[PDB]
Write a protein that binds this DNA or RNA. Structure first.
Ligand SMILES: [Mg+2]
Ligand SMILES: [Mg+2]
Ligand SMILES: [Mg+2]
Ligand SMILES: [Mg+2]
Ligand SMILES: [Mg+2]
Ligand SMILES: [Mg+2]
Ligand SMILES: [Mg+2]
Ligand SMILES: [Mg+2]
Ligand SMILES: [Mg+2]
Ligand SMILES: [Mg+2]
Ligand SMILES: [Mg+2]
Ligand SMILES: [Mg+2]
Ligand SMILES: [Mg+2]
Ligand SMILES: [Mg+2]
Ligand SMILES: [Mg+2]
Ligand SMILES: [Mg+2]
Ligand SMILES: [Mg+2]
Ligand SMILES: [Mg+2]
Ligand SMILES: [Mg+2]
Ligand SMILES: [Mg+2]
Ligand SMILES: [Mg+2]
Ligand SMILES: [Mg+2]
Ligand SMILES: [Mg+2]
Ligand SMILES: [Mg+2]
Ligand SMILES: [Mg+2]
Ligand SMILES: [Zn+2]
Lengths: 36, 111, 56, 48, 30, 95, 142
RNA sequence: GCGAAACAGUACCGUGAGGGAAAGGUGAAAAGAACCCAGAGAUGGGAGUGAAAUAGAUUCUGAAACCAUAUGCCUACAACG
RNA sequence: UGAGUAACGCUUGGGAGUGAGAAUCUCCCAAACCGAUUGACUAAGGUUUCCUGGACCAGGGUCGUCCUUCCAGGGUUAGUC
C-alpha cells in the first residue's frame, strides 16, 4: 500500500488554463488593380 | 465573562436532540460553537493512509466523535436546586472575593 | 472561394449520409474460439493448422 | 533577420534604471506617477 | 541483514536510494 | 563573534564524498553578508580548530513550485566549504 | 430497467464517436463486444472499456441475468471544449477548439423498453391534466 | 458598482513612457462517499451519510442558440422567401 | 457553417525488453545525411532550462510507458581564470 498524501498541498491534476491575448496585428498593402 | 465554560454541565434546547445533557470539553469562542460529549455524534468514513510511522497502521474504522454545536442552542443545567430546571444567568459580583460569579435569575444558585 | 450563404443543419447531414461505417467481417478461431477478423492470424498466432507466432 | 530588441544587461540598466530616472526632474515625475498607480515593477531594476 | 532491509528505497531528504549511508539511517526516520 | 554566521549544516552526496579520506570537508550555510575571514573566525571561536582553507558558493534564487496557484521564489544561500587538517575529525553535533 | 455507465471529458470528438456508436446500437452483448474489439478506430478502445464496466455493474449491482442484455442507446454527447491559439502567418492567429465528448452507454433486458418511457411521459402529461380538472371543480365549488 | 468582492494595477502586451483583463455561491453540519464490482488509473455503477446525491468538490437556480436519442405523421418524376 | 475539409513546417529497417496498451520509450545491429560542420571551446543573451527518481491534469500539430512539460531531491569550490 503506502499510498497517502500528508502534505498540505498535493494534487496530480494540476489546475491550469491557457488564455489568449487575441493578438491580431494584421495589415495589408496596395495593389495593381487601380482604375484611374 | 462567558456564559459557557469548560466543564459545567449543559443541555440542548433545540434541534433533533432535545434535553441532551452533557459536559463541555472545549469552547471555540471565535466561531461560537461548543463540543459537548455524547451529543452530535458524526461518523467520518475513515479511509486508509500510510506515509508515517504511525500512519503505517492508523487503524480507523467507524470512529464516532463529537461535532460542534452553536452556543445559542446550549443552556446551563441547574444542580444545586432540588428541582432542576433550565434558566438564564446573571453576572453578580460578590464583595466577599471581589470576583465575578454567575448566578441564575429564576433562583439564587451560584454557577 | 467561400460560401456566400451558410449551409443549414440539413444539407450537412445529407452530405454525411454516406459517412456511415461498415462492420468488418469476423470469424471464429478453430482452436480457441475468440472472434477474429477474417483471413488473419488470431491472438495465439495459430492460423489454420500452423503455429505462426508464440502465444500472446 | 536582426529584430529590434537585442538584449544587453548594461544598456537596459543604464537607460531605464532607477539611477537614470533619478537624475532629472522629468524622471522624478514619471516615477511619481508609477508609484501612484502602485506598479509592482516600479522600474526595470526590479527584474527579480 | 537488518540494515540491508532498511536501505531499500525510503529515500532520505538530501539523499537518494541505493547509496544510503552504511551507518547513518536511524536519525531522520526514527 | 556574535555567531549568527553559522546557520545550518547540510548533508548531501557531495558533502559525504568530501567528508571521507583523511582531510575532512564540512559544508555549512553561512550569512550571505559574511566574508571568508568571518567564517574562519566563527569556526575558531565555536569549534577550536583552525580551518586550512574556506571556499564559498552563492546559489541564486530561482522560481519554485511553478504552475501552482501561487508561485514562489527560492531563498538566497551562501555555502562555505571548510576543510580541517589531516587526521582531525570533529562532530558537527555534540558539544 | 436501464443499466448504464458514463465517462466525462473523453478526448475523442463527438463527431468521430457517434460514427462508432451507431455500430453498437441494438446489438447483443457477446456480438457487441466482438465487433468493437476488431475495429481499427481510436474511439473503439474507450467505448469497449465503458461497455465492459456497464455489463459488470448490470450483472453485479442491479442483478441481471447477463444473457439478455442488449445495447439500448450508446451516444456521445458534446463535452466541454478547450480553447487554444494556433500561431498563423503574417502575424495573425486562429483558435483551435479541442473537442471533448461525454460518453454514456445503456443496456436493457426487456425488448419493449421504449414503451415504458412513453408510459412515464404519458403519466406526466396525464398527471398535469387532472390537477387542472381538480382546480375546475374547486373553482365551481366557490 | 472603483479598472480591481479572489493574492488587481496582478496575469499579460511594449525597449520605454504607457496600456491593461477575466474570474463569487456544496450542504444546517464534510457528516467530502469507508466498503464491493469493472478498469492500468482517473472514473463510473452500487453501498453509506444526509431531508434532498439529478445537492458529490464539474459543487444555488440553469434560458436560448447548438449537438444527439426516441413514440406518431410525411418524404426518393421533384422547380420550392 | 465552412468541415472532419486545408494543414500537420527537410531523416529509414529490423531484433530484444519494459509496459494494461509501442512505427514514436530503452538497448543492439545496421541505414541515411553533416563533416570550414548538425563537430568542439567560449563571449553576449537566456535564468535552472543542468543531474537523478517519479508522473502522464495540461503543453508536444499524431502517439507516448517518453520529453527542454510537471513533481521531489540535488548541483556552480579561485592569491594565479
Ligand atoms: Mg439532425
Ligand atoms: Mg462524406
Ligand atoms: Mg568564488
Ligand atoms: Mg512572426
Ligand atoms: Mg514586461
Ligand atoms: Mg453518484
Ligand atoms: Mg457546465
Ligand atoms: Mg448548478
Ligand atoms: Mg413519389
Ligand atoms: Mg415525367
Ligand atoms: Mg414554372
Ligand atoms: Mg466563425
Ligand atoms: Mg464541423
Ligand atoms: Mg470542400
Ligand atoms: Mg480535398
Ligand atoms: Mg492533405
Ligand atoms: Mg516535421
Ligand atoms: Mg518520416
Ligand atoms: Mg555524406
Ligand atoms: Mg555547432
Ligand atoms: Mg521552467
Ligand atoms: Mg534530464
Ligand atoms: Mg524520468
Ligand atoms: Mg497528444
Ligand atoms: Mg590552487
Ligand atoms: Zn486462436
Amino acid at each position: 500500500x503506502x499510498x497517502x498524501x500528508x502534505x498540505x498541498x498535493x494534487x496530480x491534476x494540476x489546475x491550469x488554463x491557457x488564455x489568449x491575448x487575441x493578438x491580431x496585428x494584421x495589415x495589408x498593402x496596395x495593389x495593381x488593380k487601380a482604375a484611374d | 465573562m462567558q456564559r459557557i465554560k469548560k466543564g459545567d454541565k449543559v443541555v440542548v434546547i433545540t434541534g433533533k436532540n432535545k434535553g441532551g445533557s452533557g459536559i463541555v470539553l472545549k469552547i471555540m469562542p471565535a466561531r461560537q460553537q461548543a463540543i459537548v460529549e455524547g451529543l452530535n455524534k458524526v461518523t467520518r468514513h475513515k479511509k486508509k493512509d500510510q506515509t508515517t510511522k504511525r500512519a503505517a497502521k492508523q487503524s480507523t474504522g467507524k470512529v464516532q466523535q463529537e461535532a460542534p454545536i452553536f452556543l445559542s442552542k446550549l443552556a446551563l443545567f441547574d444542580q444545586k436546586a432540588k428541582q432542576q430546571t433550565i434558566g438564564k444567568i446573571k453576572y453578580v459580583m460578590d464583595p466577599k472575593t471581589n470576583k465575578k460569579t454567575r448566578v441564575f435569575k429564576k433562583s439564587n444558585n451560584t454557577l | 472561394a467561400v460560401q456566400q450563404r451558410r449551409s443549414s443543419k440539413h444539407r450537412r447531414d445529407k452530405r454525411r449520409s454516406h459517412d456511415a461505417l461498415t462492420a468488418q467481417a469476423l470469424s471464429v478461431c478453430q482452436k480457441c474460439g475468440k472472434k477474429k477478423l477474417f483471413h488473419r492470424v488470431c491472438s495465439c498466432g495459430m492460423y489454420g493448422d500452423l503455429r505462426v507466432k508464440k502465444a500472446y | 533577420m536582426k529584430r529590434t530588441y537585442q538584449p544587453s544587461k548594461l544598456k537596459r540598466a543604464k537607460t531605464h534604471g532607477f539611477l537614470a530616472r533619478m537624475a532629472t526632474a522629468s524622471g522624478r515625475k514619471v516615477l511619481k506617477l508609477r508609484r501612484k498607480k502602485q506598479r509592482a515593477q516600479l522600474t526595470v531594476s526590479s527584474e527579480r | 541483514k537488518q540494515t540491508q532491509d532498511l536501505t531499500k528505497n525510503m529515500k532520505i531528504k538530501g539523499f537518494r536510494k541505493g547509496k544510503v549511508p552504511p551507518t547513518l539511517a536511524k536519525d531522520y526516520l526514527d | 563573534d556574535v555567531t549568527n554566521v553559522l546557520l545550518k549544516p547540510v548533508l548531501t552526496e557531495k558533502v559525504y564524498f568530501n567528508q571521507m579520506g583523511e582531510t575532512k570537508k564540512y559544508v555549512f550555510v553561512v550569512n550571505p553578508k559574511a566574508s571568508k575571514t568571518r567564517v574562519k573566525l566563527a569556526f575558531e571561536l565555536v569549534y577550536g580548530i583552525k580551518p586550512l582553507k574556506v571556499n564559498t558558493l552563492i546559489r541564486k534564487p530561482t522560481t519554485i513550485r511553478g504552475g501552482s496557484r501561487f508561485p514562489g521564489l527560492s531563498k538566497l544561500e551562501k555555502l562555505a566549504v571548510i576543510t580541517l587538517p589531516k587526521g582531525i575529525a570533529i562532530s558537527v553535533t555534540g558539544e | 430497467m436501464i443499466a448504464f455507465a458514463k465517462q466525462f471529458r473523453v478526448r475523442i470528438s463527438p463527431q468521430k464517436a457517434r460514427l462508432v456508436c451507431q455500430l453498437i446500437v441494438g446489438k447483443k452483448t457477446a456480438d457487441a463486444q466482438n465487433i468493437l474489439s476488431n475495429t481499427p478506430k481510436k474511439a473503439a478502445t474507450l467505448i469497449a472499456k465503458l461497455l465492459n464496466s456497464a455489463i459488470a455493474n448490470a450483472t453485479n449491482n442491479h442483478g441481471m441475468n447477463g444473457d439478455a442484455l442488449y445495447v439500448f442507446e450508446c451516444v456521445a454527447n458534446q463535452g466541454p471544449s478547450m480553447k487554444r491559439t494556433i500561431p498563423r502567418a503574417k502575424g495573425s492567429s486562429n483558435m483551435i477548439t479541442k473537442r471533448s465528448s461525454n460518453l454514456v452507454v445503456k443496456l436493457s433486458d426487456n425488448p419493449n423498453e421504449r414503451q415504458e418511457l412513453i408510459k412515464q411521459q404519458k403519466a406526466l402529461v396525464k398527471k398535469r391534466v387532472e390537477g387542472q380538472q381538480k382546480a375546475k371543480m374547486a373553482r365551481q365549488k366557490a
